[PDB]
Amino acid sequence: FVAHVESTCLLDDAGTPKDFTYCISFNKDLLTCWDPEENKMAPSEFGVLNSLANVLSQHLNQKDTLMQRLRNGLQNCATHTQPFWGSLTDRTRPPSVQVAKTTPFNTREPVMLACYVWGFYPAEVTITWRKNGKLVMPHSSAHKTAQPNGDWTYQTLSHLALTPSYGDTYTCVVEHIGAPEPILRDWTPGL
Amino acid sequence: VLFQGPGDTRPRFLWQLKFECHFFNGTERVRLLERSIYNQEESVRFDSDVGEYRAVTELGRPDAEYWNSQKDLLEQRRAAVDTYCRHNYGVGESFTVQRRVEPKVTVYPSLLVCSVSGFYPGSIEVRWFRNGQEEKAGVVSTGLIQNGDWTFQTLVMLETVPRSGEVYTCQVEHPSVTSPLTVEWRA
């Protein structure tokens, strides 16, 4: 079995707790969560494990070292999240970006460019294409979100299908917080 | 007990119980179907459109009669279309209608094959074109195939003995994309 004693604090860039939970689960089933309104553990599960949920709730409801530790939930978060906070809050690594051809897929178009975007943090990012300065819609749709590398960096990509003409120059336009100016990358039909 | 041939010829007996929520137009119309099956023969059911248990086969007659006499039970099944069916449809919508995965479309000779793989949900349309002109003759398909992992695939074949200069186009319409996908092949 797997038991869970899970507390989450919903903080702010400033460092101000805007919410707070403390929850107990067992076997992936959520049993009882703290209620900061009535200052007690209230059963969340009303299925088979409900009876158990009342028993855990009441064992915890009689502990002073606990019922007040969570009555001051909000202010307690800020206290723990203060030395490293602010530090992580403005942690950014700018995104490095490249544009190359890739194997066309899902298109009649003879050429597919891929705009690679990597090493960035935070995860949020915006990619756009321009054909000779003027914007244009991408092959990409359906809400792509950055992949976490699991080491406080993220990566993503975007494609643009096209029919190459001689003068034409195509541009990858990446917008991340890690860079003051929008990153540009170019590509022209060669050979 | 009877002995012949292969190891383990011992008789098996099997009982299945099924609750089927059938949804029409979101949840505006809902039909619950509660079924009992012994071996391969369904024996008794509760069809929310009928309102009571009914034996399908002889062996189910005792149950239909017995369960219908529990005026209490009937009341709860009659209300299950809401408490169970509609309620459970509520939860999900990661599993329900909302899910959408885009097809991978490729075209390759074999007879031309248009492979449409990895999509969800299973409503799709696959068409063949020769030089802009739709070809409907000589088009067969393996069918829509469920992979068991919440994606489908299908192969749609066009029979032709290709001629040089010809452009063949497979066109795919699926809810996951706003405009049709097209992939071409030439020799």
Place this chain on the structure above:
Amino acid sequence: KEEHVIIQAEFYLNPDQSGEFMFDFDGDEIFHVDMAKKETVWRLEEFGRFASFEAQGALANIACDKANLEIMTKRSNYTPITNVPPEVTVLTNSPVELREPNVLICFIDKFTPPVVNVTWLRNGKPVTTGVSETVFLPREDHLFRKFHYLPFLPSTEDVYDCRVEHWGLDEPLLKHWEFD
């Protein structure tokens, strides 16, 4: 003309004492509980929460089905299920290219009782690493289906088989796949 179907399907089987409790959306498994593993298993991670909520009493449901089976067996004069041998097909997840990682799917369909032995053979040897398998899934006609998977890297030398055993089969079924 219907849009969607949610199916809660349970079974129990003698004398094997195997049984299941599962949910199903338009033919796809949301989650199951087995009598063999007594685990609650969600098909995709997105169904994790739902499955925990909906499976906490599944073992009792199966115990109920077991008890009903014994009443029905008795009432039917010990009439035994008729074995129906499975249809088996082997295909890939996507069109195959050399050195392009792919996935073999073995489909075991239209069979009863829900008891099968399925093994993947690579060049005649059983594969133990990387194999996944579905439990027994329900069908409108009350037979079952099952899927087995094997992620693999296509090549000209390697040759695959799905070996299936079932009491409705005179001998094991061997479905072959190779690169062409």
Place this chain on the structure above:
Amino acid sequence: NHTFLHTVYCQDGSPSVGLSEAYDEDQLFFFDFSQNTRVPRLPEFADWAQEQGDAPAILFDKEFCEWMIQQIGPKLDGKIPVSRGFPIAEVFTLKPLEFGKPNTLVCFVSNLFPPMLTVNWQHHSVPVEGFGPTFVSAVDGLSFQAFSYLDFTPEPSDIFSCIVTHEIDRYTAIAYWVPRNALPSL
């Protein structure tokens, strides 16, 4: 608005108990109850490793959780089914693929529950170093994930595999990797 996950958890089998702290879904610290040590995930994080404002809350949570496994377990064992997911591996490069340049394969394991696992890397189905540890972390919805990293230099014929062993019953999952759409030379 951001999230700070503080997740104490325990289980039958090893690791018997752990705590994972994450900011916006990246691991900050994984606690080491051996030396009551809060270990950082990156070097940059090493300094807030010893804030013991946490200790009493941590000691309570840690113990109450272990109470649950030890005292609730016996009651429910065989009475309810055990929650369990089959883990899934994906393998991809850190940097875009460029033959000859340094790179890193990332094995991202997801849908991990319960959190007991072993990761193995292979080159052409031959075992290889492993380049460090496997970082298991908690994610929202009471699930787990894990990352492992293999430093390498990609060459056109490379084939790699990642094998994940779920330690609850030695089930294995595999994910292959081959070079694709390598970036060109100026």
Place this chain on the structure above:
Amino acid sequence: NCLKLAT
């Protein structure tokens, strides 16, 4: 609850 067959 368990819906039991007729006995």
